[PDB]
């Protein structure tokens, strides 16, 4: 495929170079219109710039920590970390919320890779051979009340168990109601003054909870556990105005008052280089 | 060679191949052709 | 106050003109619906889709008589007030005869092609109400109040995904034998 | 041969009307309702036609028939202008052409005893009870959804309410000449009258003319047995049917 | 849009449904309602990206029109007309007016939108929204 | 496949919204049969509402704990937890139970996983690396007597050996003696007054015996022994009504007496939403 | 094309049973009962085959439905076992196998309300009403034609007698999964229900297990008119059908 | 591919694709069509 093509000199009364971008049309002028060019082949075809491949990178999205005690003298489990619940959501890390966010609909198949690894702060005498279930609880079904509820048998939710320090895999099939994921939602739940604007169950994948199944021991080890998400089978709609500002919140378009000038200011004149 | 039954365990499908930026770059109702005027 | 066989039974009383018999919102996960099958069988699907077929079968005596209006209103707006609020939207008027039974099809009007079976409010499925049409006339030497058996099932465009474990039975102790 | 003639359903858009004792529903004149042709039309704009939306059984309040009630009156398309989306449309467009499925309903158990004639009258032309020539005022001829109540007293530049005389000087008997049905509540529950439209030009003004008029009108005294209720339940169902519209234009002013 | 509180306030409906009248930029930020950066497009992006949407300059020198056909656009087939907007139309100056001397320092703008290829769905009684 | 048809008005002395539910059949009335409807497509097949995938997903079915001690000084090796018995059956967990027994007759073949965790709740230097034993015992065999009895030689009973911390994981053939399990048996062992109702050698898969195989060390391990099922090849007959009321044994279908209410009764009327 | 589909008659060994006022029989899960054929055969011992001698229909003692009545529990075969020859054949074979026509009976006049579920459950195994692990004895289980009646008190050993819980735990309204039918009095004097054998064997003990019970439960209760007795009779007639025994032996001794 | 002598060894069979829920919701000796008299 031709790049440049060969082009002498020009005395014509179709003069390619003006145009009206006030009619929204970006005119598909080449090198070869505005100077005289030689012949030059592409020789790149592209992949690297596929939607597929700009959004098919693994990348971190939740990271929490997790201890083996006791849980005598303890009215929250949760809040003892014994167990941690992850609202499912692709907005806590900015690296991979504005690459994603750059799109308005996106349709993926997802990809999780859970990576759990033990510290001990405290005295321990051994590495301990810790076992980590994360258990997915879709909409609707039980979230885990305490390290050992009735709800981690899972007779029917997904669960996945796996040695701390290794890691486990598993492949999700798209699950948004509709065709395609809403990046942004300029609307409502409901007909109301009062209710929540963009964030809504079109956001909703679910929670994923997680624990240490192994039972507890006489030394605290803290587990900081990591899920990472790849995207496969990526589609992309409507191609959005890129992101300036910093965030503030997970589902929400909200940026921070007396924020810093995103324009990067010339030092000297507009003549300047 | 896939090892498993479902559609969201396979690997990438590579690229989209047949790529056209008219429908971003040149949205319009009448068609332009480069050097005729855009205006008459 | 606790459970009867009477909770099956929705009152019909004579002599009632343009009154409500019954209402309910139409999570299928909930509130009524949760002990039936459909519901039952729905709350271990987290997403649903398609038609619902709602029935009702009259009890009353051979030579009563009474013309009632099922009416669904679909979601966005109030839950109907009054019958001419509730015959705006979708309805079927019942004339109670020789067939015992009226069969009325809530038909699937969404935007999005799935639901949540779990109450939210943007999945809202709508509303469902019952009204005198005429009124109910007793023949003679008779009393009280008579009954409507109510019925759920679904039809066959009716779609279910994303199994998960219900919340309708639970356990603190491994049972033993 | 095993069948059955009393089972007949009807269903326009979203709403289903049932009946398991029914008398041969009445198509006026052996007329089924359409759409305004082009040999026949006159304005030039294009007509909006809406289909499903408009299209559908509406239900007006309930009249309680009681042993002493003279009758019952209702004008279309008045009658139907606070109902949805066809009420809308009939005061936003200048011109209006639609037929109708009228469908009454009376239901009763098998000791009662009464008749009531449903009869639909083009152009029912109203008296006023004042005598000369005294006019009816719109408020009267238009009551909307709540209709006509013959039982009533006289009003000060309102209509005649002697149904005997049909409210216009005509007998009661000699309504039979116009589409009509009995429910007799010894033989029916429910009277049906399919209406074309029926008027002189092609397409015409819906806030200043009504096309029909809907007439119930007890006949043998309603004779409820010894020890039930002197009053009956009866419910009006119409629904438009073959509806056209035309010129559209800013919403429609009227009295009250 | 974005509210000018910023953290995680959400932007009230009263604010976001104004109606015919629309939403001014040059007006001063409300409790509960947007913010009113036009350069940060009032959700956090710059102005000058805005070219990447469907767009048309009204140039005073070359143009008095501008034009712009909308197809459906949603993830759905059809959806609730009274809780969501498809799209929001923003008309900004970029060049600032700039009239001969002794001219009035004002110019009429006036947007017209024809609703194209419309289709509605499960008549029900008359829908309920605040104010 | 068609989901809805294209229909327009009705008028007919057919009227299919009427009929008698008397008849014990639920008429297979449509969409298109209340109200005017448009043409569109199923575009959905039903894979998982299958039998075989609504009860083919694993779901814990026991838990025990197994310790590594000198047999000095103990009269029950079984009392101690140097070895425990799991009389085998899928009753013990509530939200299996249920899917399970949703059926009358269900014939499916059987896959089981285990998962042996280890714990230190009193003073260990190190992680220990103990080995499980999994040994079955089929009715008539000698079911083992002691951590270090005969039995566990295992000449013909089936045995798994496996690493704690780690998995073991084996198929298992449909083994009833009738042509499908019976969830429910309204009759007895014998023509007695006083023998067992329901609870019989029908529902009898036989025993698993649970022991540590490594010799005893100087530190106590406590290891928690998680047992868990997956049926393959699923067939099931005559549906049943959905179990409503919290359970109180294995094999039985008793509920407890004072039993909630289980009808989420209305806030208002019949006629409130 | 003119017939009536109300009167339908059954005619077994020399029992007939006519109606006038009949629903549509129910045949459970669309198959109808069938002699055990050898491609599914266990036991060697050739089987004796009965025919007229046992297919044929036994009405069992009537009940009394008063407007406080639960509901009424039969088991099969155990409520055939004192029924002539095929309750001598039950006891002196060692298995058997049958199929059953199922015909419930209840009669009222035109003035009467109320609405019987008639429902047949396979392998209905009872909950005692002591909770915990407590067995139902033999004794309590096996009635014979005196059935279970759900409106009496508690028994020691004995199954509980909360009918709204199905005695097992279940719900009332989700029986409809099995095969029914309703007695309405308004439509119907008749329920008709004809059973295939239904077991996960193809020939079993008749003694010491029952195949199905059979439930009559009113859910709408009884309203009789102004001055009437209070209560209305129900009567049970089952015949045997497809009838198959196996492995003859002396007499069979059971409890009581 | 199997891997395994026996049948007990394979992974599941995927789905009974023709399915007909009238021996459920229709289980009646006489065949009712919709819109006929259920009775007469």
Same mark, same amino acid.
């Given at each position: ?29 080449? &090198? ?10 592409? /020789? ?17 999205? /939740? ?11 303890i009215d929250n489990h949760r809040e003892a970390k014994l167990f941690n619940d992850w609202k499912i959501n692709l907005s806590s890390l900015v690296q991979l919320r504005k690459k994603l966010e750059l799109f308005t609909y996106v349709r993926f198949d997802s990809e999780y890779t859970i990576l759990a690894t033990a ?53 999700? &099939? ?100 | ?29 009448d068609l332009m052709l480069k050097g005729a005027p855009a205006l008459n | 106050t606790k459970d009867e066989v009477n909770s099956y039974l929705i009152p019909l009383n004579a002599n009632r003109q343009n009154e409500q018999v019954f209402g309910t919102n139409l999570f299928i996960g909930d509130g009524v619906f949760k ?12 997403? +649903? ?11 009353? %005596? ?11 209103? %679909? %979601? ?17 008027? +019942? ?6 039974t009226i069969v009325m099809t809530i038909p699937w009007t969404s935007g999005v092609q799935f639901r949540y079976t779990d109450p939210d409010t943007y999945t809202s499925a709508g509303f469902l109400s019952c009204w005198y049409q005429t009124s109910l006339i007793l023949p003679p030497e008779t009393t009280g109040q ?9 039809? %066959? ?21 | ?93 200048? @011109? ?75 007998? @009661?008997?000699? @309504? ?55 009053? @009956? ?24």
């Amino acid at each position: 495929t031709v790049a440049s093509i060969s082009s002498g000199p020009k005395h014509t009364q179709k003069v390619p170079i003006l145009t009206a971008n006030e009619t929204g049309a970006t005119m598909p002028v080449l &090198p070869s219109d505005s100077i005289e060019t030689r012949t030059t082949y592409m /020789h790149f075809n592209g992949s690297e710039t596929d939607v597929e491949c700009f959004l098919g990178r693994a990348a971190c999205v /939740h990271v929490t920590e997790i201890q083996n005690k006791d849980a005598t003298g303890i009215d929250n489990h949760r809040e003892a970390k014994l167990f941690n619940d992850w609202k499912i959501n692709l907005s806590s890390l900015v690296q991979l919320r504005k690459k994603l966010e750059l799109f308005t609909y996106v349709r993926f198949d997802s990809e999780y890779t859970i990576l759990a690894t033990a510290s001990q702060p405290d005295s321990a005498n051994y590495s301990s051979n810790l076992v980590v279930q994360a258990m997915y609880v879709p909409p609707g079904a039980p979230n885990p009340k305490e390290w050992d509820d009735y709800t981690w048998q899972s007779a029917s939710n997904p669960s996945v168990f796996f040695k701390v320090g290794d890691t486990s895999r598993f492949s999700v &099939p798209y699950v948004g109601l509709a065709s395609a994921y809403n990046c942004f939602y300029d609307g409502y739940s409901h007909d109301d003054a009062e209710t929540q604007y963009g964030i809504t169950v079109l956001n909703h994948m679910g929670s994923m909870a997680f624990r240490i199944v192994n039972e507890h021991d006489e030394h605290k080890t803290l587990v900081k556990i990591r899920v990472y998400h790849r995207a496969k089978h990526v589609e992309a709609w409507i191609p959005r105005a890129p992101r300036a500002l910093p965030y503030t919140s997970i589902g929400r378009t909200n940026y921070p008052k007396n924020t810093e000038p995103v324009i990067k200011k010339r030092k000297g004149d507009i003549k300047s280089y | 060679i896939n090892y498993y039954k479902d559609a969201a365990s396979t690997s990438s499908a590579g690229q989209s191949l047949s790529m056209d930026p008219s429908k971003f770059t040149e949205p319009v109702k009448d068609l332009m052709l480069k050097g005729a005027p855009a205006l008459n | 106050t606790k459970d009867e066989v009477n909770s099956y039974l929705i009152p019909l009383n004579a002599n009632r003109q343009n009154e409500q018999v019954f209402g309910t919102n139409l999570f299928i996960g909930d509130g009524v619906f949760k002990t039936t099958l459909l519901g039952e069988i729905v709350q271990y699907y987290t997403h +649903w889709s398609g038609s619902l077929r709602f029935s009702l079968m009259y009890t009353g %005596p051979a030579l009563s008589s009474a013309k009632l209006i099922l009416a669904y209103t %679909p %979601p966005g707006a109030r839950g109907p007030q009054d019958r001419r609020e509730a015959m705006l939207g979708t309805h079927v008027v +019942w004339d109670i005869g020789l067939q015992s039974t009226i069969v009325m099809t809530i038909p699937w009007t969404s935007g999005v092609q799935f639901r949540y079976t779990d109450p939210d409010t943007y999945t809202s499925a709508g509303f469902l109400s019952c009204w005198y049409q005429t009124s109910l006339i007793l023949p003679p030497e008779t009393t009280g109040q008579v009954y409507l058996l109510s019925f759920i099932s679904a039809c %066959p465009d009716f779609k279910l995904r994303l199994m998960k474990d219900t919340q309708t039975i639970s356990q603190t102790v491994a049972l033993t034998e | 041969c095993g069948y059955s003639d009393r089972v007949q359903q009807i269903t326009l858009g979203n709403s289903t009307i049932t009946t398991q004792e029914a008398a041969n529903a009445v198509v006026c004149y052996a007329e089924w309702p359409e759409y305004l042709p082009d040999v026949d039309a006159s304005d030039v704009n294009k007509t909006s036609k809406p289909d499903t939306s408009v299209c559908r059984f509406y239900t007006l309040d309930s009249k309680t028939w009681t042993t002493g009630s003279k009758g019952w009156c209702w004008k279309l398309p008045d009658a139907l202008k606070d109902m949805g989306v066809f009420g809308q449309n009939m005061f936003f467009h200048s @011109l209006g052409r639609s037929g109708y499925t009228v469908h009454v309903q009376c239901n009763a158990t098998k000791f009662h005893s009464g008749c009531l004639l449903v009869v639909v009258i083009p152009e029912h032309q109203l008296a006023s009870h004042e005598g000369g020539n005294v006019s009816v005022k719109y408020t009267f001829t238009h009551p909307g959804e709540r209709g006509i109540d013959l039982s009533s007293a006289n009003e000060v530049g309102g209509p005649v309410k002697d149904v005997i005389y049909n409210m216009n000087g005509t007998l @009661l008997g000699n @309504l039979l000449i116009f589409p009509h049905q009995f429910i007799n509540l010894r033989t029916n529950n429910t009277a049906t009258i399919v209406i074309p439209y029926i008027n002189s030009v092609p397409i015409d003004s819906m806030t200043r003319h009504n096309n029909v008029s809907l007439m119930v009108i007890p006949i043998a005294p309603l004779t409820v047995p010894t020890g039930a209720t002197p009053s @009956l339940p009866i419910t009006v169902t119409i629904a438009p049917m073959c509806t056209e519209f035309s010129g559209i234009r800013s919403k429609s002013i009227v009295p009250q």
